[PDB]
Paper text:
The genome of Mtb encodes 13 mycobacterial membrane protein large (MmpL) transporters. These membrane proteins belong to a subfamily of the resistance-nodulation cell division (RND) superfamily of transporters and are critical for mycobacterial physiology and pathogenesis, with several of these transporters involved in the export of fatty acids and lipid components to the cell envelope. MmpL4 and MmpL5 share similar functions in siderophore export and are required for iron acquisition. Mycobacteria secrete mycobactin (Mbt) and carboxymycobactin (Cmb), siderophores with an extremely high affinity for Fe(III), via the MmpL4 and MmpL5 transporters to recruit this important metal that is essential for growth and survival. According to the protein sequence alignment with MmpL3, it is speculated that both MmpL4 and MmpL5 are proton motive force (PMF)-dependent transporters that function via a proton/substrate antiport mechanism.
We then collected single-particle cryo-EM images of the MmpL4 transporter embedded in LMNG detergent micelles and solved its structure to a resolution of 2.95 Å. Our cryo-EM structure indicates that MmpL4 is monomeric in form with overall dimensions of 110 Å × 75 Å × 55 Å. This transporter consists of a large membrane-spanning domain formed by 12 transmembrane helices (TMs 1–12) and a large periplasmic domain formed by 2 hydrophilic loops (loops 1 and 2), consistent with the signature of the RND superfamily of proteins. It should be noted that our cryo-EM structure contains most MmpL4 residues except for residues 495–689, which presumably form the PD3 subdomain located right above subdomain PD2. It should be noted that our MmpL4 protein is a full-length protein as indicated by size exclusion chromatography (SEC) and SDS-PAGE of the purified protein. It is likely that subdomain PD3 is highly flexible, evidenced by the fact that we did not observe any cryo-EM densities arising from this subdomain even though the contour level of the map was set to a very low threshold. Similar to MmpL3, the structure of the MmpL4 transporter also forms an elongated channel spanning the pocket surrounded by TMs 7–10 at the outer leaflet of the cytoplasmic membrane and the cavity generated between subdomains PD1 and PD2 in the periplasm. The pocket located at the transmembrane domain and the cavity sandwiched between the 2 periplasmic subdomains potentially harbors substrate binding sites for anchoring siderophore substrates such as Mbts. This elongated channel is continuously open and directly connects these 2 potential siderophore-binding sites. Therefore, this conformation of MmpL4 may represent the open-channel state of this transporter, and this channel is likely used to export siderophore substrates. Based on the structural information of MmpL4, residue D278 forms a hydrogen bond with Y852, presumably enabling the transfer of protons to facilitate substrate transport.
Residue numbers in the entry: 21 to 494, 690 to 949
The structure:
Amino acid sequence: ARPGGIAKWIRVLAVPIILVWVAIIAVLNTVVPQLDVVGEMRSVSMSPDDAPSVIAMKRVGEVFEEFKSNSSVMIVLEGEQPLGDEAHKYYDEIVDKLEADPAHVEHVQDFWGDPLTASGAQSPDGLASYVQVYTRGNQGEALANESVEAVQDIVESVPAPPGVKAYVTGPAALSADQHVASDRSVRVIEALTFAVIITMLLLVYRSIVTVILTLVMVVLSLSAARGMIAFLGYHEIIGLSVFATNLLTTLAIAAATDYAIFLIGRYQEARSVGEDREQSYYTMFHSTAHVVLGSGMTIAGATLCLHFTRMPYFQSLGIPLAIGMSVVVLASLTMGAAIISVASRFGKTFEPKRAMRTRGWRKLGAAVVRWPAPILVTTIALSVVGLLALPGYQTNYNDRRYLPQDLPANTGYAAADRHFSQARMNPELLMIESDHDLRNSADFLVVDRIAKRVFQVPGISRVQAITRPQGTPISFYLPPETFENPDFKRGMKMFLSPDGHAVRFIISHEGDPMSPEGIKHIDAIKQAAKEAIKGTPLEGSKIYLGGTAATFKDLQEGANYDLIIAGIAALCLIFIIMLIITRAVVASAVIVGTVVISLGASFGLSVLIWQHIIGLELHWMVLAMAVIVLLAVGADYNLLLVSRIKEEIHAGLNTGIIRSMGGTGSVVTSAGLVFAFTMMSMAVSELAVIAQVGTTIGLGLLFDTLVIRSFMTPSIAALMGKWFWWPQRVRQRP
């Protein structure tokens, strides 16, 4: 703990460091609009540009020369009276104003305006109708969001008939309203988070000056991280998703508070022993700076490991989170060290106010070292009972239930569900692109065969084709005289390619295409079409199938494998960081394995609460987003405890554990409580996925703070003895 190294440089350059950090924070906050504005502008596609569903939909748009993007929303009309006179008119002005805005609307698939296909766009009771309009964008980008906003504005501009109401729904509408749901509760999230942290810092320190300075450090670090992320995103360097902003804000605040708590706790412990301010600061730095740096590097690397998946949301989550956490770590180490150094020499600023809680934690350490075998067994049992949630763990792929029901997309879905069957606003599009003109009598037998065979597939409730213009059935033969009928000419134009080389089918699911059963439906439809076109003068045609079910098939087929690989990479990277810091293989393995064990209890608590008490099943992204943060932060707490043990080995393996636990008990307890409660502060989010992720991470941090670091790791250390620090040389005796 001799004065020297980076600590002395920071202490002597404290004021310049603070001024430089403040200046760059101001620059990054005054040269770019804001993080929320950038995230709205730089929203990422919900699906990769090379996904089979995206390619199929763009190919359908290109062949038919209608659209070129991958965004579409459904406009549904709901009237108290049956849709009749003046309702068709209202629909007509709506579609006319839609086709007069090429900047947002690419094509309007007008089925209800055509008497041939009018019955196919109406509900059986006749009280509702819908039209699919194709907008510009890729269903998740910003451009798609302004497209949906423009469509809603156009719909609301037209005066409605006395009893007819129009809604704008669809998966693109749901994605667009995700952003507006976030940017109405993100402020509530940050306000509640700051209130919680202020209260808990007041409880921990009982000092107003210390709390104010901790808030200053946290606010400056958060502003630096958010400014860096906004600067990167605004320059189209990184992509930002809706979840990225919320997780970045909460994680930055919580991690900054944790680093401040670590530094201040070490400084105040050094002061309580009876060391002057300079030696106290030097001891704090030499004991906690590497721990904080490694703790932040673990979070940064763990979040970075998400970039290696194929899901665009997870890449948009990965790099920005890593950059934000790294900026938080620098603005914690350098800024907090400088601020502590400056403020210590201004009276009783950071001086401890109440007491230190060694005696209780020393008694707990004595209990742990006395019975290391009976303990760690209770902890393994408490961590594995969460696996009882596997027989019954249900995941939900539909984002409809994870958004407030008052959003325009949810309202439109609710209105459609009153009159139409389930998932009629999410149709599948099947295109079979041939190599010859299909507008002859022979090929319509094949087309009708395809329509009939796809309809006969279980889980398919409606197939709309040229031979079934209304989606319902009317040995087949069309006389050539039908080809000159103008009604049939319009039908072929609306269902066949302009050159006649492609045929289009609209397919509606019996159930929800969100589920993996809807994923099996895609393969069933493709196989049925391939067998239908078998042994006919149409073989070799390229089958394109696109829609919601195909999109989520492309998302989910490799998602589980990608997430497993990402988690394994995160574990490996955290283990490498622990190995670099502690220089002990066994200690690093224990640190990274205890959190893996506690993942069971975290998962059990989350699947219990959300799936049973609340009733809302866990979103299929929640575990993926939560496991990374859990592994990072639990390993960080274990790192702090293990490093403190390492500093105390010279007194003995058992006395070292006892003294280290006594030293770090209250500090790590406060840090873990702050992190967990900041994480669960997302419970007020209007994005139920965000709330689920936050509550899961908070419950996991509460569990491991109360169990793992307290009893499991110390008991493992006591059991291992000299082998805990392997292959490090161990004194092994006082």
